[PDB]
Amino acid sequence: MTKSKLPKPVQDLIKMIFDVESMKKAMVEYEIDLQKMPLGKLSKRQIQAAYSILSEVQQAVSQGSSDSQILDLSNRFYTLIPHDFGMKKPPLLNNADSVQAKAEMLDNLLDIEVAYSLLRGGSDDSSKDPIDVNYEKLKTDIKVVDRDSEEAEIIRKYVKNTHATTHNAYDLEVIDIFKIEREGECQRYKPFKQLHNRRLLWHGSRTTNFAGILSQGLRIAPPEAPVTGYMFGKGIYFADMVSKSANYCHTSQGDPIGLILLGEVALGNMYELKHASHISKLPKGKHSVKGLGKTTPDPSANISLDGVDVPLGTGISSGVNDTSLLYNEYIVYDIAQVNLKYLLKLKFNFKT
Numbered sequence: 001m002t003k004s005k006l007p008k009p010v011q012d013l014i015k016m017i018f019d020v021e022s023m024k025k026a027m028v029e030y031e032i033d034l035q036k037m038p039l040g041k042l043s044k045r046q047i048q049a050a051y052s053i054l055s056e057v058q059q060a061v062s063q064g065s066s067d068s069q070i071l072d073l074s075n076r077f078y079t080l081i082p083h084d085f086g087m088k089k090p091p092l093l094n095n096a097d098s099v100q101a102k103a104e105m106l107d108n109l110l111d112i113e114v115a116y117s118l119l120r121g122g123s124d125d126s127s128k129d130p131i132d133v134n135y136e137k138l139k140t141d142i143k144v145v146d147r148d149s150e151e152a153e154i155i156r157k158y159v160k161n162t163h164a165t166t167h168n169a170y171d172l173e174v175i176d177i178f179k180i181e182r183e184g185e186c187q188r189y190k191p192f193k194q195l196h197n198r199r200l201l202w203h204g205s206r207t208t209n210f211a212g213i214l215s216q217g218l219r220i221a222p223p224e225a226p227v228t229g230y231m232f233g234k235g236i237y238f239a240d241m242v243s244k245s246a247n248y249c250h251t252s253q254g255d256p257i258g259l260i261l262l263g264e265v266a267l268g269n270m271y272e273l274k275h276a277s278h279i280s281k282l283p284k285g286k287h288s289v290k291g292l293g294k295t296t297p298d299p300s301a302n303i304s305l306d307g308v309d310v311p312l313g314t315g316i317s318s319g320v321n322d323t324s325l326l327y328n329e330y331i332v333y334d335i336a337q338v339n340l341k342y343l344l345k346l347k348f349n350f351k352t
């Protein structure tokens, strides 16, 4: 039992990422019946089948089919994924809002299954630290960034300047800044290295999703998933406001620690949109979608970190009139266009 020699912040990141109990709390959060469907019985093909029902609902809504099939499909969904709503009525699956809500849950279920499968697979060695074994499963080089360097100064300033006044429920404190290097991702990203308009953007996610996020990278919703469950289609979503992405950590009062990503995203030509557009492909010659937000990080204060633009400017009006987005959103539809650079441990201080 050789005790791990990894730095203490990296060891804590490993423990927090592979926490089986956190995976169970996330499933209870969705009111999933863990007695009828324990974490060990959660299956990949089960999740894709549930995605198919969501897509079947989407098509039934789109042709008028009949709302009673939609009733049957909704009941079929709750049979496939056993829930426990105690005495209340389970939410019906008859409108686009409920399809998005269940697609989001399946997104988290998909990454939770990947994490658990990682843990219970491969090899195990009694003489090895579980932290050391779980670290190697991530297939990622993780190094703690020195607090006093210019990387951390830029990253801290990115956090400090782009917390929107709208997201007033909490404030953010940077605990740890990690430099991350997924195996093979640098080679995969090379075909996009010298594309224009490369920005450093945030991606917030639930803590449980990060075992899959680090082992497999950011992925696109599977083909079974309904394209109308996502505002701008089935792509990878980023933000330039740290608080916009931190909201997608789903941090609570009982679990105030969150994980957020800083990724280099090859945006190229930007299909600028102001409202929903459930697309699967992009128009020829366009490399990403930008949701136009009312507030944008002041473009006068942009800096370059390793030839990548960092929109750490404070929030100002964008001049866009008829848009449905409070803040900007960046979406790519090819996973090769993303190169993950930094991983942040954030403490959420909720104001009460």
Ligand SMILES: CCc1cn(Cc2ccc(F)c(C(=O)N3CCN(CC)[C@H](CCO)C3)c2)c(=O)[nH]c1=O
Pocket: 107, 202, 203, 204, 205, 213, 217, 218, 219, 220, 221, 222, 230, 231, 233, 234, 235, 236, 237, 238, 239, 244, 245, 246, 248, 328, 329, 330
């Ligand atoms: C605006 C910034 C922001 C938004 N949203 C919401 C959101 C909405 C629709 C989306 F398609 C995705 C997204 O990118 N997905 C969907 C889930 N997963 C399916 C395989 C993937 C995850 C990586 O494996 C890819 C994310 C976050 O969650 N975080 C953020 O920072």
